[PDB]
Amino acid sequence: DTKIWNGMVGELVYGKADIAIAPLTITLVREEVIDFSKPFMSLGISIMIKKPQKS
């Protein structure tokens, strides 16, 4: 609605913060306002299920 970045990106856009070191997943629209570095930690959607029981 407001098209205002909240969170850590809006602290970088509006000059509140100087840099961000955080678990920040790189999307396109985040790069449209600020600059990422290279992805140091590649990941994705994993499948968390239970562990086979000791019954």
Ligand X SMILES: C[C@H]1CC[C@]2(OC1)O[C@H]1[C@H](O)[C@@H]3[C@H]4CC[C@@H]5C[C@H](O[C@H]6O[C@@H](CO)[C@H](O[C@H]7O[C@@H](CO)[C@H](O)[C@@H](O[C@H]8OC[C@H](O)[C@@H](O)[C@@H]8O)[C@@H]7O[C@H]7O[C@@H](CO)[C@H](O)[C@@H](O[C@H]8O[C@@H](CO)[C@H](O)[C@@H](O)[C@@H]8O)[C@@H]7O)[C@@H](O)[C@@H]6O)[C@@H](O)C[C@@]5(C)[C@@H]4CC[C@@]3(C)[C@@H]1[C@@H]2C
* Binding-site ranges for a second copy (CB under 8 A): 26, 36, 38-39, 42
Which residue lies nearer to a second copy by CB, 4 or 29?
29
Q: Are 30 and 6 in contact (CB under 8 A)?
A: no
Contacting residues for 19 by C-beta, under 8 A, at least 6 apart: 12
Q: How far is the CB of 50 from ligand X (least distance, A)?
A: 45
Dist. CA 38–CA 25, nearest whole Å = 11
Q: Is 20 in the site for ligand X (CB under 6 A)?
A: no
The listed partner (a second copy, ligand X, none) that binds 15, CB under 5 to 8 Å by sort, is ligand X
